[PDB]
Every structure is written in C-alpha cells, then in structure tokens.
Amino acid sequence: DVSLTPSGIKVNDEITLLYPALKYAEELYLLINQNKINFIKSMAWPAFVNNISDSVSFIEQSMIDNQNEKALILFIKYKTKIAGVVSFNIIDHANKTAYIGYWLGANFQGKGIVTNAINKLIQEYGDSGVIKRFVIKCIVDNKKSNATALRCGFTLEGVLQKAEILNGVSYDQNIYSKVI
Ligand SMILES: CC(C)(COP(=O)(O)OP(=O)(O)OC[C@H]1O[C@@H](n2cnc3c(N)ncnc32)[C@H](O)[C@@H]1OP(=O)(O)O)[C@@H](O)C(=O)NCCC(=O)NCCS
C-alpha cells in the first residue's frame, strides 16, 4: 500500500496525515494560537495552550501514545501547511474500537479535509479488520461536527447526558458510530 509512507498516511494529492514530530511544534502552536478564541467554544484544552512548549509537550506525549497504540494522533497536512489534527483519541484493543477526534484551523474549514481524512482512516483500519467499531462523540450543539459524522456515514446511537465538561459546565454529547 503505497499510501502508507514512513512520514504518514497519504489521503489524496493534497492531504497527508503526518505522524507527529517535534519539528511540527512551532507551526502547530501558531495554528492553535490563531484559533484559540473559537476553539475554546468547543474543546477544553485550547484554553491552556500558552506557549510553544505546550505544543512540544503535546507532541512528546502523542509520540509515546502512538508508539504504544494507546492512541493514533496525526497532524493533518493540507498542501504545504499543517491544517489541524485527526486522531483515534482512544484505541480499545480488546473491543476493536476507536474513538475519533479532530479539529481544523478556520482557514482550513469548508474544504472536506476531515471527511476525507476519516474516510481514509476507516478504510485503512476498518477494511483491514484492525478496528470493528469507530465512534465520534461530541457536544450536541456542535453543528459542524454532527454534519461531519453524518457525511462520513456514521449513525447516531443516542445522547450521552451531561458527558462533557467545558469550563465547569457539563454538556450532553451525541454518540455516533460506524461499524465494519
Ligand atoms: C468539526 C470541524 C473539523 C468540521 O470542519 P469541516 O471543514 O466542516 O469538515 P469536513 O471535512 O466535513 O468538511 C465539510 C465542509 O467542506 C465542504 N466541501 C468542500 N470540499 C469538500 C470535499 N472534498 N469533501 C467533502 N466536503 C467538501 C462541505 O460542503 C462542507 O462545508 P459546509 O460546512 O459549508 O457545508 C471544524 O468545524 C472544527 O475544527 N471545529 C472545532 C473543533 C471541534 O469542534 N472538533 C470536534 C470536537 S467535538
């Protein structure tokens, strides 16, 4: 499979999902910084990304988790730029289940980048039998994420009541799945 390269997974001519590396720390940090205000609306962690060193620490931990298959953290490269992150936040090996996460900088939204990335990951891990069940869980009012999940052929399984905390408040999540 020539799409599985040493540096990452080639989705198409424009998108590669890069294995994390320290060299990406600067670009990743700047991207988060540019999007911090909007990102804080939908994710907890951006509120605390204050220096490049925080992105270095994230990369270091992501590489450890990737090595041990605890997670699969990938940096989305669109053309020449890092666009965001797509991940299996959690890989449950016993139950062959992967929980998906993602984000894109504002300048990279509306381009199908995450949809294309997810479809590729599901082909690679799902059609090979490594993962049986893929899950997207996100706060109910996250309109763009809901659209992405449905666009990728996921099915709504239910609402997880008061399951995600942002800034001390618990919010309901939709849980979507795609089963091979
Ligand atoms: C969730 C998020 C990644 C969605 O980004 P996105 O760009 O809408 O994601 P997709 O890859 O599904 O792209 C779909 C959009 O690209 C457009 N489109 C353009 N080219 C396309 C292509 N090649 N394939 C599919 N759609 C394409 C679609 O029409 C759609 O645009 P629309 O929203 O104007 O209808 C983004 O809103 C984000 O990063 N949000 C903050 C982080 C977050 O909330 N993460 C999830 C935590 S719960």
Ligand SMILES: Nc1ncnc2c1ncn2[C@@H]1O[C@H](COS(=O)(=O)NC(=O)[C@@H](N)CC(=O)O)[C@@H](O)[C@H]1O
């Ligand atoms: N410090 C950091 N720097 C850069 N990216 C980071 C990061 N911390 C996390 N991410 C990435 O942010 C994305 C979204 O992860 S998330 O934990 O904020 N939320 C969810 O997954 C929802 N679906 C809710 C749920 O799954 O319950 C993932 O791709 C992570 O790898």
